[PDB]
Symmetry: D2
Subunit: 460 residues, 4 copies
């Protein structure tokens, strides 16, 4: 059923113009001004921007971190993201050793199946390279568009992998045509620090941060790079936090190495102090890598501005401060890591970035949608507003001033890391593939509408 | 008179899709598929790409380098560029000390007046900062869209300016909203080297290169940067040649400094040896900075690939090998510097870059058009294929294999620096503002059709 | 019994003068010219240099690497070094997990006890940091002058330690006042490479080198540094081989970090090719890190010249090519790592370094004796020729040209890695604490004369 | 007349031991303990260190900076340095264009002739490279031991030289065997800044500093280096002040380039604030490069600690705050640059450096004496305490606590830049070539005793 979004200001990763969009088969049929066609529902976007739906490449929805599981599942999370201006997510499908990869992949397909309000895809976790694994990978690429393999350098005895596993993954990746993602923190050192902290009675939420200094993020990020170099493949460092890390990634890209960096709003806006703010409130901000000192934020922004860092992810991993977060009272190491971010990701960048001088209206769209779609083989189906691309759009209001509050967010968590934060700009209507998911700040989608996405081989 | 370019594959700096373009007021009216409108001339672009016309920010047309002047004037040069897929050029309007800036600006306007086949703009040369100059600059910005002021760090006693001049220019620029361009070569050292070379009988074309080692390009590029930092303004290093230079620019951009780098095909494809190839043929390749050792080419390409360098210019400055180039027989320093490049710029990057694995079809468009339009305030009038933008298009054939030959080029020079070079891809139809300038590899424009362009203040 | 070494040219790490040395209580009593004292044995050193005995901080004598043990034990090895101009060695006392440190320390004291011809000390290996270990360390410092604790980043499942162990060692070290030494190679990656090499039939000696690329040495050296920085202690990288490694150490020292680098002759003179030279001869050159490509040698020398690297060790670990080396025929990983170097260390540096333009006669003395004595708390007892210091001297002939041959060396190995090598300069008389150990190229010492050395706390 | 300094603790750049020195022909005859010889004056040094007299390579004594001349001439200055523990100075012999070099050299010889209390040498200033200059240089080396040529990159229209002059000097130097010294500050930029400062009424002493930002010192230092590289010669950057400069010099030495850095106490202890401290007092601290922000001091010390910087000079250039300094009341640019430092140089480094943890008792001697003697061809005549070397000694008391005060200093200036500064350690007896110049903190020398020094060709 044809639609026409008129009088809006279109803003792609490159262009900024005024025109109307004629949506047809759930795709953009044509762009121009004063469009008309009997029967079109004609949506009015006056005084609004029309962005390509956002893409969150860093999602953890039905993921289990402890005896508990994320408060937000694939259903709530999808809706949240939908309100936040995000219309496509790529969640991390976790893997267990010895167990066949297609096992996990189906487990995840079930988690998402019929509950997604918007489209999604997966990243495959890798904790070991077995002959059995090597045999599946190629299949995992063709059947199941999983073209991005992930690796934890931290989280000893839980996700961590030795450099040998990382290295062979990089090769396999280069060979098969996949992008290696990496959680760059020196697990082995963080481990001793963690143990000693506890051994000395330091259990408060803040020791979560002090127990893992930025030096260890930088160090890890470096190895990932050096190895990626040796292997001659491609790297994508997730959630770049400290300056040290930004630096390593900068050097890499200078050498022509195919390395990419990503960050998350929480690291751009919040900081280490929030972990001290008080009683047990700290736990609300416990996630890895830990929030750093306020000063790193600049470095991140500049990196974003000049290109050292090129994508923004949420690292969405919700846990009620109530039941969940409290699991680690007299033990910080027992606080489930993760924050409720999938919803305010886009907004915050526009507000803190665009609206304040950092980033450009175009850089914005690139950092939150396009660049990502490209790196993860979703372009041009996703990531842009052009004839042929899916009608994943966001009718955004750039002037509405508001305050982020858990009293308003649509995530199933009992709190919001950006509570009380004033923000300029807000999504008004968000549609995925020609169909509204959120019209006039009101939900109108249906769980199951979202469909899985097989992704390009890191090629066209 | 309405037109429709159908069945082409549209390729912007971001998008790559299939659709038709409905050209209206010399601008792009609308994009979509199966477009129709009685009376439209309907152009067929099957099996072709449709790029935003190229923009050459580095042009020297009616410029005089010696007792002689460039073989190509604004008329021939414009046509050449037109055939080469370039529809907008920004020539360097030279300045004389003590003489009022508006004097030169009009001299240039005359050189271009009624001879341009495509649109153009100017860069204002600066050899000194006088109170009189400071008074004109602001006017030079508002009246006359000249928002890019240029400086030579080399060419002692001819264009060169001390760091004080460079520094105050950077300030003035930051203040007024202009981009400072720089020819980064250590003129004072190159000078002694030059003199000594001659004093020892080394007069062949090759000593033009040996007389100015890449160390001096890097050194100069560094000062420009360090000073740009101190001043807190914006830099744009023209024709980056050696690795050393690329490096300095890389460091700058890492520090968040607002520095930009540009290169030219000749430095990407040719190399120092050509200056030895033989008799006097060397002089055909004499230009500054000099061609370096083959190995720097990689560095350049990687810089282009990863973003250290972001724009491609021609540095067009033609001289017949016959009369002109020969002016410096027993004296290389008397060979007029400059090469016939304005025509094959775009093609070479597509062929050597895109077609061979370096750059992307999108990076290509960015490096040759978009990125440039943006940095020099011509976006979105120029630099892209979108509703509202000027209909500056290029219907390109990506498969036609051919050989660059002066026997075929459309420049008024008796030779071509890329003679015999095999190239893949070629412009078939090039239109500026809805009107064909070159249809089916045949010229159909009219000198004077091209119009001057007032450019943005380094802002929207 | 008083002695007088006259007519020699004294060369310390700083001075170069002509005088006589009056040796008294096994120490240098006084320096001056035309010395006399009834009853003094008066040794004549005309046309000779008098260097402070060399100090080899990298020794593995009675060490066991496999079902076998080093061909040279503390007795032969001591004599060898004695002939080589080395009068003090610091061997690496290996440690086993769970087993008390003082156990090993005594095991070693036994290996050396009554067999040493010259003085010696120990380095304590660390494979784990236990509460039990933390309790002994302080004692290990006071009782037993062991002030240098060593860590293997490679040799997985044999010596290797995680970064946590390395990090806590660095702290303990900073706290206790010890120097952390490190074998910087990424064991986990070398491991997979090793396994795969075999899995593909690559078993020749050369795969020992290819199985462990310099990238992995640099990578490892980097971590060691970064961690040393975090901990704020002191590092000493043993056997720096590749450029990558030299670079990391250079960066560290630039940052003011207290990092030190050491190299060995074999890496300064031999290279990767020797591992291909032929049949099974390759095995003669198998040791870790592996010999690199000829070009790294320069980097090493420059590092040595300018100070990036400051000490020369042998990494003495002999194995008869016959029985021992052959243990790894169809399996390179089974070739015992180590080379017969303790004897030609000093000579080679003088010849290849001093005599050829690299290093200085003074730098020489510093790199082979003084600098080492200082870093390992043996100064000024050892490492110099000055009133009060032990009479550890070497009467060297700087002109004697000769050829290193196993047919002449005094090591118990059936071969010599520098066989056929022409060398200028040779030790004529070597005395430890006033007593000759080697007079006129003839052995005159007695096993047991050498005494253990308790070393300074990395202090005065 | 034979002398014996007994019971002292000898401290060279390498050694630290207890012995007696038998001084003979004004040189050190022999070292040992319990020395005796009828008729020797036997000096007692119990509880004292005995250092090799200090060497100040950065002196400006009878130099004229304006219509005025340094308050301290070669006589007073010599005595001052003598009290300060310095026994050898190398003053900068200034040069005028067009005027023959030997003219200036004799002018200087006159300034020093019969007024020096200790030994001295000269540096030859170079403001231009003429054929006439090229002819003298070689003579200037053989006749007149002037083997160090100096160049100002700042002080436009007064001492400044273009890069061409600097470059050819570097070559000449490499060729002839001289060391090029450089005052690294970007004169052309400092110039505009200076002019503008005045044009805006900023005339206070502090604008002397703000008028020349550290970016300009680093920039300049970089060129000197890059050029020194191109030329392949040797550089020696005088008075390294900011971090930026230290960095450039660090990079240089990393590349193996033969570059050296020097600093001065005032930059190690004082800082920018002193220029604001108040009324006109600021002028007391006006010298170039200007004092920087307190934080650079660390960088300097670390550079000194790790070796990025290797020598300490005074940059002595006294001017009575009264008449002289006041010449620039309403104009800072008219304040004669230079500070009264030749006397407390050594002491301050011992106190602030040695006594406080930075530097070593040995590093101390190296940084203030030895390293310098070596770089400027005075070793081993000067710079060490060894048989054969001149008896230039300093009997130092390491515990005497005191306060530096113009009320006590022996310089002819009406003030002291370190007034009120508490310092530990003080010279008790200073003798040059076996003769006391200062015995028991009391002057006993005679102007004229000091003799000129022809220096080595940057060789043995
Ligand atoms: Zn993570
Ligand atoms: Zn995550
Ligand atoms: Zn140019
Ligand atoms: Zn040009
Ligand atoms: Zn080892
Ligand atoms: Zn070893
Ligand atoms: Zn100076
Ligand atoms: Zn000076």
């Amino acid at each position: 059923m044809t639609k026409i979004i008129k009088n809006g200001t279109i803003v792609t990763a490159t262009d900024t113009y005024e025109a109307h969009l004629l949506i047809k088969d759930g795709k953009i049929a044509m762009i121009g001004q004063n469009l008309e066609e009997k029967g079109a529902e004609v949506i009015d976007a006056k005084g609004c921007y029309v962005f390509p739906g956002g893409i969150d490449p860093h999602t953890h929805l039905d993921m289990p971190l402890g005896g508990t599981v994320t408060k937000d599942d694939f259903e709530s999370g999808t809706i949240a993201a939908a309100f936040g201006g995000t219309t496509t997510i790529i969640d991390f499908c976790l893997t267990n050793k010895g167990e066949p990869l297609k096992k996990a992949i189906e487990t995840w397909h079930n988690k998402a199946n019929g509950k997604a309000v918007i489209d999604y895809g997966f990243h495959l976790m890798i904790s070991e390279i077995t002959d059995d694994v090597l045999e599946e990978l190629p299949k995992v690429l063709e059947e199941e568009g999983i073209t991005s393999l992930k690796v934890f350098m931290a989280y000893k005895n839980v996700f961590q992998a030795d450099d040998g596993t990382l290295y062979c993954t990089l090769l396999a990746a280069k060979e098969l045509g996949a992008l290696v993602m990496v959680h760059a923190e020196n697990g082995d050192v963080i481990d001793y620090l963690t143990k000693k902290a506890l051994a000395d009675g330091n259990t408060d939420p803040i020791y979560h941060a002090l127990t893992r200094p930025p030096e260890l993020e930088g160090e890890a990020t470096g190895r990932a790079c050096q190895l990626t170099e040796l292997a001659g493949s491609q790297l994508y460092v997730v959630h770049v936090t400290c300056a040290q890390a930004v630096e390593k990634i900068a050097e890499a890209r200078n050498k022509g190495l195919d390395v990419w960096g990503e960050t998350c709003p929480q690291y751009l806006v919040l900081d280490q102090s929030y972990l001290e703010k008080p009683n047990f409130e700290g736990a609300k901000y416990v996630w890895s890598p830990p929030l750093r000192e306020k000063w790193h934020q600049e470095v991140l922004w500049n990196a974003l501005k000049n290109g050292q860092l090129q994508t923004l992810g949420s690292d969405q991993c919700s846990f009620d401060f109530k039941g969940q977060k409290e699991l680690g009272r007299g033990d910080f190491t027992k606080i489930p890591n993760g924050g409720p971010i999938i919803e305010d990701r886009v907004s915050i960048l526009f507000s803190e970035g665009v609206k304040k001088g950092r980033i450009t209206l175009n850089q914005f769209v690139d950092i939150v949608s396009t660049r990502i779609a490209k790196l993860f083989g979703l372009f041009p189906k996703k990531g842009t507003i052009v004839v042929g691309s899916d009608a994943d759009l966001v009718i955004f209001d750039p002037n509405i001033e508001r305050v982020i509050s858990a009293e308003t967010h649509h995530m199933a968590v009992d709190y919001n890391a950006f509570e009380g934060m004033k923000v300029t700009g807000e999504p008004v209507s968000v549609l995925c593939r020609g169909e509204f998911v959120v019209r006039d700040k009101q939900f109108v989608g249906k769980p199951g509408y979202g469909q899985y996405l097989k992704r390009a081989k890191y090629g066209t």
